[PDB]
Amino acid sequence: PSGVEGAAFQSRLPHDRMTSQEAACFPDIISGPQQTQKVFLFIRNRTLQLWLDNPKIQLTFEATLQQLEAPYNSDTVLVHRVHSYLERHGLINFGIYKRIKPLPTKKTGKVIIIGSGVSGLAAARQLQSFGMDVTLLEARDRVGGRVATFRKGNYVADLGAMVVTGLGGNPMAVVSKQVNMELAKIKQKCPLYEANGQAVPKEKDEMVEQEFNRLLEATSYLSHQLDFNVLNNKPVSLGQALEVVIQLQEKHVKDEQIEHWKKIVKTQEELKELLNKMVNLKEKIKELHQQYKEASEVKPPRDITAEFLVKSKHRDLTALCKEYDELAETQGKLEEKLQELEANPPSDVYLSSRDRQILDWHFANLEFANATPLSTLSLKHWDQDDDFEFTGSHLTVRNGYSCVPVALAEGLDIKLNTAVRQVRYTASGCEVIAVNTRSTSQTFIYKCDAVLCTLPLGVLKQQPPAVQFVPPLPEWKTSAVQRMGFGNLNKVVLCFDRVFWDPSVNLFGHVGSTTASRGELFLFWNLYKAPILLALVAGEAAGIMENISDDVIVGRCLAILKGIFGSSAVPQPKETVVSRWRADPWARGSYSYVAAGSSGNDYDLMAQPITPGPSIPGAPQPIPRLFFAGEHTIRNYPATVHGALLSGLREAGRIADQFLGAMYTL
Amino acid sequence: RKPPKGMFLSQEDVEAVSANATAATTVLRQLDMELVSVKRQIQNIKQTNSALKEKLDGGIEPYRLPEVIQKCNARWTTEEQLLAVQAIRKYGRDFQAISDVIGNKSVVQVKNFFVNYRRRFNIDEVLQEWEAE
Ligand SMILES: Cc1cc2c(cc1C)N1[C@H](O)C[C@H](c3ccc(F)cc3)[C@]13C(=O)NC(=O)N=C3N2C[C@H](O)[C@H](O)[C@H](O)COP(=O)(O)OP(=O)(O)OC[C@H]1O[C@@H](n2cnc3c(N)ncnc32)[C@H](O)[C@@H]1O
């Protein structure tokens, strides 16, 4: 889409309709006449466009009104209201901009932010933009969290997020114009290569891939159409559902063979009844011929009864020779109607061993995408966010993704090496207690009006707790934390003196031997300016490879590669790195998934802030004090960088509305 | 509305492969065996029919008589009349046969004869004696 409607789309909003959020702040408008709504909508879209067309500089209320036109520029409270709403909720003037109106003289309210993940940073920057006293506590010695980027010499390789998923309505689109990220597109071509070391051929490649996609649509049909969604008390997983589909496919393969070979017997059986008839006719014929012979022996001249005899016997014999010729007729039809069936068998197998194995690699790639065994994904919900996908080719960050969190961190009060251990929140405020990771008995206390927790879900999940809430989080929150899924996948980074692979190719599979190892080193990436290949470990494998050493891993890596490019084309790798995200204590995994028996809804629960009890009993209800952002809190963009970034934007808006008030609602 | 093309998933079937853990491989073995059971039965008849086939060897060739191709006539030699009465005894109303036997009378003349000589050859009686068989 383009013009002002391009902007609405590029900001993830319907260009011709007011959102539920806007209804909330603009209920005068949206409860009123159409005419007004359109004016509103325009002002909105227009402002967006302005910001979008140039996000390296702040868009002020003045700048906006300047470039509006009558009738729109006529009502300046409405313009102001809109511009302010937008600004507040990070629709405009987010990321990194030059500010016109330099920072408020002194600040108002104080927030502690747990984690300088992207969600963290994004929210900080916002709040600081809104004149707040913000400080972030990062446990690590670097920003970015699960945006990790390896750098040594000229080697640059993300151990964390790696892909931008299409700029079509992606906040990262904006950020990329604000930060020199060097975006290469990913070429979707991906050769596979069987355990042996030799390519799969286009033939199979495509015929398996297509069966895969076919088996997916299938699962979906079980879910929505047949309602196959509980299995004797238990939510059904995608994994389960897929087997059930595959079985039913194997079965129908045989039900077919059965009926086709059952036509064969039903056919020969007729043939047997006919051959019988035929053999008993050859007899009655053999014997009447005898008879007619015997009766032509009586030599003429003769009485008429003996003449009759010959003639009758004659007719009777020709009659029966009709019949036997009409049966040999039939016998001929049937007899070919059998070289007919025997020429068209149905298919012998549903999928061969070589097939079912390639098909695994397609399932590994799902396990990669969801960071989990498909046996854990919710059938009904695993893909529930497919509706919000961006448009555009996926991409990589050739200069490394860290460039972003780093960028965002500038200007900001970030305490590195500071592990939060306890969150205390109460009617009149909060205190957060953290330690210093390098010496742990050193201890810190931060008092604030509000806490924003960007702790990873794997962390929120630790038993026993790595962070303690005081008071404890309500049951509703903790149930959501159990229910939700937090998966894992790892990377192996391979640095070489020279490119020995196809430089026009970004991806390339390795098919595993077993169903069980499908995700082990199943996929490699040529992404970077230097000679670096990067290899995913996903699915069940991910979890277990953490427990094997780096050499043992890099072994299997090179073994695969030598296999595919030849024993002597594959040198010793100069530098190697191996992720272990499930082990990493500030992650405890890689990202969330919709586990079986979760829904999208839990993501919404993850985001609802917590409002402490009143201090003195019968005092009025507090303000909320404890807020949440991150990958796990955004129902519509889970598990991604932008998703995080977005949840940051979100909470900052929310927090500010709470402590600075929101003059834009009147 | 409907599955993908050539994927099969009936309500009923789904249930049968999900009744328990190996209710899956149960169903798929009864089929594996059903199949071998049919497949052998085929060889049985294939074998039975191959033996009946060998019994018709030679066809009916040394048993076929040459062709009487002969010119349908209108008068009834007494010879012919007698052949007919006897044909009637042996064939009843199979005018077609009776014509073939007599050699040179159409299926109708044969019919006509019946009503003409009904009196003289007591066909009434002759026919009722055919019926005693
Ligand atoms: C781990 C991971 C994550 C991801 C990826 C890879 C890996 C290995 N890649 C993959 O290649 C596919 C994935 C992909 C996905 C979907 C898709 F459609 C396509 C491709 C993708 C990607 O390609 N593209 C993408 O957009 N996202 C990927 N992810 C997921 C993202 O990295 C992830 O959503 C964001 O980085 C989340 O940021 P955020 O919520 O801020 O969490 P965070 O962990 O960054 O921040 C928390 C902070 O708190 C700190 N901390 C911890 N404990 C404490 C403590 N006790 N005290 C004080 N501080 C603490 C932590 O130390 C940290 O600094």
> CB of A538 closer than 6 A to ligand 1?
no
| Residue bearing tokens 């196959």 | A228
Is there a single domain that holds both residue A227 and residue A245?
no
| Residue bearing tokens 């349908």 | B72
- Name the residue at shortest CA distance from atom 17 of ligand 1: A640
Closest chain A CA to residue B55: A279
Retrieve residue A204's tokens: 């199979």
Domain count, chain A: 3
Q: What is the resolution of this structure in A?
A: 3.2
Is there a single domain that holds both residue A38 and residue A146?
no
Is there a single domain that holds both residue A550 and residue A451?
yes
CA–CA separation, A441 vs A157, rounded Å?
35
CA–CA separation, A393 vs A416, rounded Å?
36
Is there a single domain that holds both residue A178 and residue A258?
no
**B78 Cβ contact list (under 8 Å, min separation 6):** none
State whether residue B125 is helix, strand or coil: helix
Is there a single domain that holds both residue A290 and residue A327?
yes
CB A114, CB A120: distance < 8 Å? yes
Is there a single domain that holds both residue A195 and residue A269?
no
Is there a single domain that holds both residue A159 and residue A69?
no
Cis geometry, peptide bond prior to residue A301 (ω within 30 degrees of 0):
yes
Strand A230-231 relative to strand A234-235, pairing:
antiparallel
| Among candidates B48, B64, B65 on the partner chain, residue whose Cβ is nearest the Cβ of A272 | B48
CA–CA separation, A212 vs A359, rounded Å?
7
* Distant-in-sequence contacts of A606-609, Cβ < 8 A, 24+ apart: A606/A457, A606/A477, A606/A480, A606/A481, A606/A484, A606/A630, A606/A632, A606/A633, A607/A633, A607/A634, A607/A647, A607/A650, A607/A651, A608/A477, A609/A651, A609/A654
What CATH number does residue A24 fall under? 1.10.10.10
Cα of B35 from ligand 1 centre, angstroms: 53
Retrieve residue A661's tokens: 């008030």
Instruction: Name every chain A residue with its beta carbon within 8 A of the beta carbon of B18.
Output: 231, 244
Cα of A240 from ligand 1 centre, angstroms: 28
Q: How many CA atoms lie within 13 A of A249 on its CB side?
A: 24
Range list of β-strands (E), A195-307: 230-231, 234-235
Retrieve residue A276's tokens: 């019988």
Cα of A641 from ligand 1 centre, angstroms: 7
- Residues composing chain B: 133
| Closest C-alpha among A224, A217, A223 to residue A249 | A217
The DSSP call for residue A221 is: I
Strand A414-415 relative to strand A133-137, pairing:
parallel
What CATH number does residue A327 fall under? 1.10.287.80
Is there a single domain that holds both residue A48 and residue A117?
no
Retrieve residue A93's tokens: 């003037």
CA–CA separation, A136 vs A139, rounded Å?
10
Instruction: Name every chain B residue with its beta carbon within 8 A of the beta carbon of A245.
Output: 7, 9
| Closest C-alpha among A296, A281, A328 to residue B65 | A296
Instruction: Name every chain A residue with its beta carbon within 8 A of the beta carbon of B41.
Output: 265
Cα of A507 from ligand 1 centre, angstroms: 22
CA–CA separation, A585 vs A537, rounded Å?
19
H or E segment to which residue A24 belongs: helix A20-25
**B80 Cβ contact list (under 8 Å, min separation 6):** B102, B103, B104, B105
CA–CA separation, A46 vs A28, rounded Å?
20
CA–CA separation, A322 vs A330, rounded Å?
13
Retrieve residue A438's tokens: 């390098």
CA–CA separation, A629 vs A12, rounded Å?
19
State whether residue A371 is helix, strand or coil: coil
Range of the domain at A46: 1-109
CA–CA separation, A112 vs A454, rounded Å?
11
Beta bridge partners of B132: none
Cis geometry, peptide bond prior to residue A471 (ω within 30 degrees of 0):
yes
Task: Decide if A221 and B3 are in contact by the 8 Å CB cutoff.
Answer: yes
| Among candidates B2, B39, B83 on the partner chain, residue whose Cβ is nearest the Cβ of A308 | B83
- B40 — contact with chain A (CB < 8 Å)? no
What is A564-605 written as a DSSP string?
Answer: HH-TTT-PPPSEEEE--TTT-TTTSSS-EE-BBTB-THHHHH
**A303 conformational bin, left if phi > 0, alpha if psi -120 to 50, beta if neither:** beta
CA–CA separation, B47 vs B41, rounded Å?
10
| Closest C-alpha among A572, A199, A204, A165 to residue A356 | A204
State whether residue A303 is helix, strand or coil: coil
| Closest C-alpha among A586, A208, A272, A155 to residue B52 | A272
- Which of A351, A370, A399 is the last residue in one of the domains? A351
SS (H, E, C) A474-534: CHHHHHHHHHCEECCCEEEEEECCCCCCCCCCCEEECCCCCCCCCCCCCEEEECCCCCEEE
Angle formed by the axes of helices B107-116 and B78-91, nearest 10°: 90
Is there a single domain that holds both residue A225 and residue A241?
no
**A608 conformational bin, left if phi > 0, alpha if psi -120 to 50, beta if neither:** beta
CA–CA separation, B46 vs A92, rounded Å?
82
What is A382-449 written as a DSSP string?
Answer: TTTTGGGPPBS--EEETT-TTHHHHHHHTT--EE-SEEEEEEEEETTEEEEEEEESSSSS-EEEEEES
A236 is in an annotated binding site: no
A-B interface: how many C-beta pairs under 8 angstroms? 134
CB A526, CB A505: distance < 8 Å? yes
- Name the residue at shortest CA distance from atom 30 of ligand 1: A640
Which residues 300-319 of chain A have a CB within 8 Å of chain B? 304-305, 307-308, 311-312, 314-315, 317-319
A146 is in an annotated binding site: yes
The backbone torsions φ and ψ at residue A127, rounded to the nearest 5 degrees and listed phi first, read -60, -45
CA–CA separation, A378 vs A376, rounded Å?
6
Is there a single domain that holds both residue A374 and residue A473?
yes
| Residue type for position A170 | N
- A254 — contact with chain B (CB < 8 Å)? yes
> CB A418: neighbour CB atoms within 10 A?
23
CB A448, CB A111: distance < 8 Å? yes
Retrieve residue A147's tokens: 């945006």
Task: Decide if B31 and A254 are in contact by the 8 Å CB cutoff.
Answer: yes
CB A265, CB B42: distance < 8 Å? yes
Instruction: Name every chain B residue with its beta carbon within 8 A of the beta carbon of A251.
Output: 13, 17, 27-28, 31
Is there a single domain that holds both residue A592 and residue A515?
yes
Q: What is the dihedral of CA A350, A352, A355, A360, to 10 degrees?
A: 80
- Which of A57, A86, A109 is the last residue in one of the domains? A109
CB A414, CB A136: distance < 8 Å? yes
| Residue bearing tokens 């036509």 | A263
- Which of A303, A325, A351 is the last residue in one of the domains? A351
Task: Decide if B8 and A249 are in contact by the 8 Å CB cutoff.
Answer: yes
Is there a single domain that holds both residue A356 and residue A487?
yes
**B33 Cβ contact list (under 8 Å, min separation 6):** none
CA–CA separation, A234 vs A72, rounded Å?
56
Which residues 52-81 of chain B have a CB within 8 Å of chain A? 52-53, 55-56, 59-60, 63-65, 68, 79
- B90 — contact with chain A (CB < 8 Å)? yes
CA–CA separation, A172 vs A590, rounded Å?
20
